[PDB]
Enzyme design. Structure first.
Site, PDB file in Angstrom:
ATOM      1  N   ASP A 186      62.397 108.056  20.823  1.00  0.00           N
ATOM      2  CA  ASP A 186      62.399 109.662  21.016  1.00  0.00           C
ATOM      3  C   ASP A 186      63.559 110.292  20.691  1.00  0.00           C
ATOM      4  O   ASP A 186      63.384 111.562  20.009  1.00  0.00           O
ATOM      5  CB  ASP A 186      61.770 109.895  22.337  1.00  0.00           C
ATOM      6  CG  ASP A 186      60.574 109.185  22.851  1.00  0.00           C
ATOM      7  OD1 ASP A 186      59.945 108.777  22.016  1.00  0.00           O
ATOM      8  OD2 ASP A 186      60.199 109.132  23.865  1.00  0.00           O
ATOM      9  N   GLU A 187      64.797 109.967  21.016  1.00  0.00           N
ATOM     10  CA  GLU A 187      65.907 110.622  21.103  1.00  0.00           C
ATOM     11  C   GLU A 187      66.404 111.024  19.502  1.00  0.00           C
ATOM     12  O   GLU A 187      66.848 111.958  19.150  1.00  0.00           O
ATOM     13  CB  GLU A 187      67.122 110.172  21.626  1.00  0.00           C
ATOM     14  CG  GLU A 187      68.210 110.881  22.163  1.00  0.00           C
ATOM     15  CD  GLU A 187      67.847 111.955  22.953  1.00  0.00           C
ATOM     16  OE1 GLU A 187      67.436 112.003  24.026  1.00  0.00           O
ATOM     17  OE2 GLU A 187      67.356 112.888  22.316  1.00  0.00           O
ATOM     18  N   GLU A 223      72.403 114.882  22.537  1.00  0.00           N
ATOM     19  CA  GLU A 223      71.240 114.055  22.120  1.00  0.00           C
ATOM     20  C   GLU A 223      71.545 113.427  21.247  1.00  0.00           C
ATOM     21  O   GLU A 223      71.406 111.927  21.029  1.00  0.00           O
ATOM     22  CB  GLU A 223      70.264 114.798  21.888  1.00  0.00           C
ATOM     23  CG  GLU A 223      69.378 115.373  22.980  1.00  0.00           C
ATOM     24  CD  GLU A 223      67.870 115.985  22.658  1.00  0.00           C
ATOM     25  OE1 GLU A 223      67.053 115.760  23.467  1.00  0.00           O
ATOM     26  OE2 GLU A 223      67.656 116.487  21.720  1.00  0.00           O
ATOM     27  N   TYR A 249      63.698 106.679  34.330  1.00  0.00           N
ATOM     28  CA  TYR A 249      64.892 106.080  34.887  1.00  0.00           C
ATOM     29  C   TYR A 249      64.787 105.851  36.427  1.00  0.00           C
ATOM     30  O   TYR A 249      65.159 105.006  37.093  1.00  0.00           O
ATOM     31  CB  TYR A 249      65.933 107.307  35.055  1.00  0.00           C
ATOM     32  CG  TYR A 249      66.471 107.733  33.560  1.00  0.00           C
ATOM     33  CD1 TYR A 249      66.880 106.563  32.742  1.00  0.00           C
ATOM     34  CD2 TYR A 249      66.239 109.047  33.016  1.00  0.00           C
ATOM     35  CE1 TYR A 249      67.156 106.829  31.395  1.00  0.00           C
ATOM     36  CE2 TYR A 249      66.851 109.182  31.655  1.00  0.00           C
ATOM     37  CZ  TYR A 249      67.162 108.396  30.998  1.00  0.00           C
ATOM     38  OH  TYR A 249      67.564 108.483  29.474  1.00  0.00           O
ATOM     39  N   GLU A 283      60.798 114.272  27.450  1.00  0.00           N
ATOM     40  CA  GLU A 283      62.000 114.193  28.529  1.00  0.00           C
ATOM     41  C   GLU A 283      61.555 113.834  29.669  1.00  0.00           C
ATOM     42  O   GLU A 283      62.418 113.149  30.449  1.00  0.00           O
ATOM     43  CB  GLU A 283      62.859 115.400  28.423  1.00  0.00           C
ATOM     44  CG  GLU A 283      63.364 115.477  26.855  1.00  0.00           C
ATOM     45  CD  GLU A 283      64.685 114.666  26.360  1.00  0.00           C
ATOM     46  OE1 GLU A 283      64.685 113.690  27.192  1.00  0.00           O
ATOM     47  OE2 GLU A 283      65.374 114.863  25.584  1.00  0.00           O
ATOM     48  N   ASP A 297      68.996 113.474  31.150  1.00  0.00           N
ATOM     49  CA  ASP A 297      67.597 113.802  30.880  1.00  0.00           C
ATOM     50  C   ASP A 297      66.871 114.657  31.891  1.00  0.00           C
ATOM     51  O   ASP A 297      65.831 115.320  31.754  1.00  0.00           O
ATOM     52  CB  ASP A 297      66.728 112.645  30.465  1.00  0.00           C
ATOM     53  CG  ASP A 297      66.670 112.374  29.017  1.00  0.00           C
ATOM     54  OD1 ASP A 297      66.891 113.077  28.067  1.00  0.00           O
ATOM     55  OD2 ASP A 297      66.553 111.200  28.650  1.00  0.00           O
ATOM     56  N   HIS A 315      61.327 110.271  30.129  1.00  0.00           N
ATOM     57  CA  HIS A 315      62.366 109.718  30.264  1.00  0.00           C
ATOM     58  C   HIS A 315      62.858 109.676  31.899  1.00  0.00           C
ATOM     59  O   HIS A 315      63.395 108.779  32.451  1.00  0.00           O
ATOM     60  CB  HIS A 315      63.508 110.245  29.328  1.00  0.00           C
ATOM     61  CG  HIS A 315      63.140 110.113  27.858  1.00  0.00           C
ATOM     62  ND1 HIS A 315      63.707 110.858  26.894  1.00  0.00           N
ATOM     63  CD2 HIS A 315      61.922 109.679  27.373  1.00  0.00           C
ATOM     64  CE1 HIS A 315      63.458 110.527  25.757  1.00  0.00           C
ATOM     65  NE2 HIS A 315      62.444 109.699  26.121  1.00  0.00           N
TER      66      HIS A 315
END
Ligand SMILES: Nc1ncnc2c1ncn2[C@H]1C[C@H](O)[C@@H](COP(=O)(O)OP(=O)(O)OP(=O)(O)O)O1
Ligand SMILES: Nc1ncnc2c1ncn2[C@H]1C[C@H](O)[C@@H](COP(=O)(O)OP(=O)(O)OP(=O)(O)O)O1
Ligand SMILES: [Mg+2]
Lengths: 357, 150, 357
Positions: free
Chosen positions: A237-238, A204, A122, A115, A84, A118
């Site tokens: 989302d993915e 993805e 993380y 993204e 990501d 994301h």
């Protein structure tokens, strides 16, 4: 030459998805393909922030893990951060100069933006389970077991970005640049775009879903549940993201959008098959590194590799590619729950008299 | 396409430039005032046939309530607007009449004392009209002018 | 050559804002310049959607407007749509390949995304005040009073994108491309970036705020109030946007990021001054066009032109440029409300006795 506001007043409904006139006016009252307008509306509705998720219990669970389970979790997290990280910038850099209809342009920027959330989540998880996040982040670039897979994905992006610059600076044709001859073929550019979208679809829809199994395997044991709460949002989302690349690929392949592309899609069919098959092998290879020091309840090298082959067949079939692995039932069915939201006393003697024993 | 009712009873098409001209005059030379503020704070409700004298009284109220520490000069903008309105109320115009012509009409109406005409001659009244400086009405503050008309 | 994931392990804290090593890993636990991390957090907290605002009452207000005030409103809306159409794609296309620190990369992507929400809200407003939105949109590209400034604004972006492609494809040096000689100077690229950011700063800090005056002047009359809520939300983002460009420009000008850049910023001071002055003059001419058929309560050519000079001095001062206009107090002070958020009866005779009358 690319222009941020093209001078021509063009009917955007008749332009192709890519390589047409650069989008000028951003309007959303109409769409050529309304799939991308729906993906925008749906991604905007899923908007979430990482800090609004409680992850405080995860530091205790992580430090209580066995050392080899610390390895599984933190390696799957570093790989997630890497993928990501590419996905934050790449759809914006590689696709925005090529898109020619407004709904697809805005989706790519919305796709990319989600993204970065994301990427920030993380950092949120990492900074709340380890003592020095610098140890985790610096290992992403230097670890030889990780950065190897990075260059495979980034190459398809980099090559499309390079050919795009030549196509804008020089136009189509045979050119000479500092002596050496340089040929700019739009058909070879359409071929590099289609190959790139195929690589992203495998990234993805296969690569990340292999990672989802790891995060959720800890959650099935009621461990790392704050991480699992975030990964579940990321997976939501993915699912929108891979739907976008599927629709792009299928609209290009059928030639509904660009008849020339239907021809080109056939010339890549073998490259795309090998592209997806390779991705599965690379993830199976990554699984060998995750369980190099041991496995856990519900997940090992074999189980995860079976899910790689299981999910690969589904994705490749969705884009008209041949199935490379044997048919198999879902080896981890528990993952699906994470990837979606007085007696009537009356008697009649007369009726009984009408009887023959 | 709507009409405003002038002071003399006649009507003409509504023209906001007339309001801009008045306020630009009243804000002339003043510091830290705003024509736009006075118009918007007026919340002036237009309707077909709206009296022009009621329109002016609205922007006086609006400019008067904008008197603040950060914008003290509104005391002069609202005063100049109020003097203008008061000139029209008594004379129908801006320029006041001659001192004699006024005293004559006023003593005739019983609003002034009778002795003004007996103790001063027309030649004496015209001499005092030269003393008058009607531009000194431009040195009042708004509180002063309201106490004058009130 | 641009790469979506650079292989070299670089200390991201020592990289410059631009032209350094392309960002690889996207981490948010540390920053070189933390102003951009705050801008991300603040923009993420401001997240709004256009549909969550009621604009249905605005159609009644619009149709009741005078004929020339429909024009004033609808022209400022066409111009707004155009500017934020450019701003939707341009920061991503023009800046992402040059950025070399992760916080500035992610901010530019968040900045761009938030602009697409503005573009979507203009479609929302248009769809709820006019009967055929196509009438408004089709006029945006051909409009004479707009397309003059449209092609001028996009040029700074287009030129920076082009030089960036040459710098990535060829690198620095004197090159030959199909006979014609092409010189690629990094110093000339750093100069086109600085000029672009200056143009963007004038675009977002002067051009839009002149437009804000028009939208909010109707709101002070309790008209178009659904529009005003959206423009108010846009204005809150627009304050974050110009702050980003201000910090970029000042960090480049002060040489904190690049010693070479401090010298280059001085070579452009005159060009940048003329850049802002031209923008201010263009908007005053634009104001002259808005009120050609009449004015409205609280706004005419004088008032708006005074705000052009007022806001221009403020913006140019913030980036170290000489003030082109006379000092002036705010001609529309009302706009600030839209741009920022018994008896103690006891007696003692002895104490009183200590007295002499
Ligand atoms: N056509 C118009 N439409 C709207 N407002 C107007 C118009 N003309 C004047 N006004 C405003 C401006 C002033 O602030 C306010 C008082 O104007 P004023 O000139 O005293 O009234 P008037 O023009 O009817 O009388 P006069 O004949 O003495 O000029 O009315
Ligand atoms: N020297 C001055 N003294 C006083 N007022 C002035 C002067 N110069 C300009 N003005 C302003 C005051 C008024 O607002 C405006 C003219 O007033 P007025 O005769 O009412 O014109 P108007 O705009 O109402 O047109 P009309 O009265 O013919 O309808 O100009
Ligand atoms: Mg008059």
């Amino acid at each position: 030459a690319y222009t941020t506001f093209s001078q021509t007043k063009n009917d955007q409904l008749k332009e192709p998805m890519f390589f047409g006139q650069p989008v000028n006016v951003a309007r959303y009252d109409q769409q050529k393909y309304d799939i991308f307008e729906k993906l925008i509306e749906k991604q905007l509705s899923f908007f979430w922030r990482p800090e609004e998720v409680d992850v405080s219990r995860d530091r205790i669970d992580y430090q209580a893990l066995p050392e080899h389970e610390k390895h599984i979790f933190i390696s799957n997290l570093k790989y997630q951060t890497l993928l990501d990280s590419i996905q934050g910038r790449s759809p914006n850099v590689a696709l925005l100069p090529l898109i020619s209809i407004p709904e697809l342009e805005t989706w790519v920027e919305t796709w990319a933006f989600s993204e970065t959330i994301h990427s920030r989540s993380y950092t949120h998880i990492i900074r709340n389970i380890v003592n020095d996040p610098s140890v985790v982040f610096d290992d992403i670039v230097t670890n030889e077991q990780i950065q190897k897979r990075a260059e495979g994905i980034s190459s398809y992006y980099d090559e499309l970005i390079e050919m795009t610059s030549y196509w804008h600076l020089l136009g189509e044709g045979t050119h000479t640049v500092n002596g050496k001859t340089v040929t700019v073929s739009l058909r070879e550019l359409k071929k590099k775009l289609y190959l790139c979208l195929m690589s992203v679809n495998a990234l993805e829809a296969i690569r990340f879903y292999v990672s989802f199994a790891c995060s959720f395997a800890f959650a099935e044991r009621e461990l790392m549940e704050g991480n699992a709460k975030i990964i579940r949002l990321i997976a939501r989302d993915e699912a929108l993201h891979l739907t976008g690349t599927q629709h792009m690929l299928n609209l290009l392949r059928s030639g509904a959008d660009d008849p020339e592309m239907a021809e080109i899609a056939e010339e890549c069919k073998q490259e795309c098959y090998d592209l997806f098959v390779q991705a599965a092998q690379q993830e199976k290879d990554w699984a060998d590194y995750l369980f190099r020091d041991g496995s856990m309840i519900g997940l090992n090298k074999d189980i995860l590799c079976q899910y790689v082959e299981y999910i690969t067949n589904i994705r490749m079939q969705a884009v008209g590619l041949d199935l490379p692995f044997q048919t198999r039932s879902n080896p981890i069915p528990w993952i699906n729950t994470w990837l979606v939201s007085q007696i009537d006393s009356e008697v009649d003697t007369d009726d009984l008299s009408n009887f023959q024993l | 396409n709507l009409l405003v009712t002038k002071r003399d009873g006649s009507t003409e098409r509504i023209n906001l430039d007339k309001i801009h001209r008045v306020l630009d005059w009243a804000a002339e030379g003043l510091h830290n005032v705003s024509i736009s503020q006075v118009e918007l704070r007026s919340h002036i409700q237009f309707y077909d046939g709206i009296k022009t004298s009621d329109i002016h009284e609205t922007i006086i109220k609006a400019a008067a309530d904008l008197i603040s520490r950060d914008a003290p000069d509104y005391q002069y903008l609202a005063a100049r607007l109020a003097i203008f309105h008061l000139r029209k109320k008594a004379y129908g115009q801006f320029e006041p009449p001659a001192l004699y012509d006024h005293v004559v009409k006023m003593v005739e109406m019983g609003k002034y004392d009778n002795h003004l005409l007996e103790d001063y001659t027309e030649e004496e009244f015209k001499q005092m009209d030269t003393f008058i400086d009607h531009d000194r009405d431009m040195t009042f503050s708004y509180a002063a002018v309201k106490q004058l008309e009130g």
